[PDB]
């Protein structure tokens, strides 16, 4: 298969029944030489903040001199972006060969037990572990698909575990209460392995405390063991101070606006430090500083254009958006145009001057109106050229706009 047929092949996998075990992925991983048992890993999960922390952890460790593998849910919708090494998406040619290798193994298996198969995420996940082990990265930062305990990635013993936060976003698949969802996340907490978490809501905190009591895991929690005593807007991003048991790292600078992000940055820092300490690896404040300064955040209050001033954001859920409104008030003091394509609609119309509501690209249109972000964009630029435009609402839109306007 060529690159295109390869990606199509990955998306053709069946929606196999959910189960508590990892037998399917394990059977495939076994046929791949169990690459998940080798090397080092940092396991990350959380309702929100998961990808932000994981990305930051990677940049920090990369700046310290390590080759870091990263398995994530990208905002840019190109498949290759899910598996990276030192933030470089897996090359098309390498994906084609990797897919071929895993397929051959898959076909040998089906030759043994005719009914054998895996889901798409299990296939991709097994392939990711294999890839990282093949390239022999120093460590692979792994983001749980969703939940944790029964997630396809949950087949490793990491150096550190990370639980950013617990919320009801994915309640449909993980549970009706914070406790039930929390029990899924706590599943990535392992015996003797440290766990770094944000300042979890009571029920989530109670579930973690009981879990670490059984695992014996050292528990470092945001706003208890480490925190951010200072944080303020600084140009298109912010300057903040990190503090923990060892002291402070003053005025770090990351190009990521959004008061909520300092919590994910601190989590990342603390996690990187735990990793280094657990592996006798050097990590300096200069390394931390360098990693955050060079970090990149596609679709997060990203100013993809200065003149005209265009901003793209992935704010989708009612919480990620209300937070966005808060960020825009800090960044802009002038009238702006907001183009929104959602899957929160009154919090925008009531917050900003001009607001266009368009459909989300590549999605059914169910039952301020424009037939597309492009029409909304052209109308605003034609009516008021000097007026900044913020495009948000979903994720498919963000990458649609980003891809169209960036290449």
Curated annotation (Swiss-Prot):
EC code(s) of this entry: 6.3.2.17
pH-related activity note: Optimum pH is about 10.
Misc. remarks from the entry: In contrast to many bacteria such as E.coli and Corynebacterium spp., L.casei cannot synthesize folate de novo, and requires exogenous folates for growth. L.casei metabolizes folate to polyglutamates of chain length up to 11, with octa- and nonaglutamates predominating.
Name listed for the protein in its UniProt record: Folylpolyglutamate synthase
Signal sequence range: none
Cofactor stoichiometry and binding remark: Binds 2 Mg(2+) ions per subunit.
PROSITE patterns attached to this UniProt entry: FOLYLPOLYGLU_SYNT_1, FOLYLPOLYGLU_SYNT_2
Oligomeric form and interacting partners: Monomer.
An example molecular function term from Gene Ontology annotations: tetrahydrofolylpolyglutamate synthase activity
Cofactor names: Mg(2+)
Pfam families reported for this sequence: Mur_ligase_C (PF02875), Mur_ligase_M (PF08245)
Amino-acid biosynthesis among keywords: no
Functional summary from the UniProt entry: Involved in the conversion of folates to polyglutamate derivatives, and likely functions in the retention of cellular folate pools. Catalyzes successive MgATP-dependent additions of glutamate to a pteroylmonoglutamate substrate, with a high preference for 5,10-methylenetetrahydrofolate (mTHF). Thus, metabolizes mTHF to the tetraglutamate derivative, but longer glutamate chain length products are not observed. Tetrahydrofolate (H4PteGlu) and 10-formyl-H4PteGlu are poorer folate substrates. In contrast to E.coli FolC, this enzyme does not display dihydrofolate synthase activity.
Keywords carried by this UniProt record: ATP-binding, Ligase, Magnesium, Metal-binding, Nucleotide-binding, One-carbon metabolism
Top-level lineage group: Bacteria
Recorded name of the encoding gene: fpgS
NCBIfam families membership: folC (TIGR01499)
The keyword ATP-binding belongs to this UniProt entry's keyword annotation: yes
Residues the entry annotates as binding (6R)-5,10-methylenetetrahydrofolyl-(gamma-L-Glu)n: 75, 82, 399
Binding-site residues for Mg(2+) 2, renumbered to this chain: 170
Entry binding sites for Mg(2+) 1: 73, 143
GO biological process: one-carbon metabolic process
